[PDB]
Design a protein that fits this description.
Chains A, B, C, D, E, F, G, H, I: It is found in: Perikaryon; Cell projection, Axon; Cell projection, Dendrite; Synapse. Chains A, B, C, D, E, F, G, H, I: Residues 1-30 have a biased composition (Low complexity). Nine copies of one chain form a homononamer. By secondary structure, the first copy, chain A, is mostly beta strands. Chain A has no helices and two strands. Chain A has strands spanning 2-11, 22-29. The two termini of chain A are 12 Å apart. Strand 1 of chain G pairs parallel with strand 1 (5-11) of chain H.
Chain lengths: 31, 31, 31, 31, 31, 31, 31, 31, 31
Amino acid sequence: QLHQQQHQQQHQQHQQHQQQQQLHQHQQQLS
Amino acid sequence: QLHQQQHQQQHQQHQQHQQQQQLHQHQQQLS
Amino acid sequence: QLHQQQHQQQHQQHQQHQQQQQLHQHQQQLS
Amino acid sequence: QLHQQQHQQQHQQHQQHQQQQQLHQHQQQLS
Amino acid sequence: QLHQQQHQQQHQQHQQHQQQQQLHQHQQQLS
Amino acid sequence: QLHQQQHQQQHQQHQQHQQQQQLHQHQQQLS
Amino acid sequence: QLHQQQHQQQHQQHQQHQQQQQLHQHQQQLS
Amino acid sequence: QLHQQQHQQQHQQHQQHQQQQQLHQHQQQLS
Amino acid sequence: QLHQQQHQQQHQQHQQHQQQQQLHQHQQQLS
């Protein structure tokens, strides 16, 4: 038996001038 | 039996001038 | 039996001029 | 009485191969 | 009475291979 | 009475191979 | 008599997740 | 008589997660 | 008589997580 959990979060609030911004979320699982 | 948990968080608030900003979240699991 | 927990956090508040900023979160688990 | 002046200039001449170039002009005023 | 002056200049001439170049001009004024 | 002057200059000439170059001009004034 | 040779090569194989990748090949010759 | 040879090579194999990667090849010849 | 040879090589294999990587190859020849 194998279990594999991955969780990612990006929260943002009251923001201004987020020019040329990048948010990257990247996930891989192998067997 | 194998368990593998990964968790990532980025919180941001009251922000200004986040120009050319990068948020990277990267995850890998192998067996 | 094997357990493997990884946790990462980046909190930011009342910020200004975070130009050319980088937040990197990187995780790997192997067996 | 309040006065607030902002001025920005970018001049370029006899140029070649300005590939993936970025010119950013950014201005804010508050009260 | 309040006065607030900001001035920025970027001049460039006879240039070649300005690849992946960045010119940033950033200004803020508060009260 | 309050006066606040800020001045910035970047001059460049006869240049070659300014790859991955960055010119940053940053200004703030408060009261 | 003048001879001027320029050669560039980029080979890639068995690849994954080449996100936001850049391959630049740049050539100039003058007289 | 003048001869001028330039050669560049980038080989890559069995790769993963080459995110925000840059390969730059740059060549100039003058007379 | 003038001869001018330039050679550059970058080989990479079995790689992972080459994030924000840069490979630069730069060549100039003058007369």
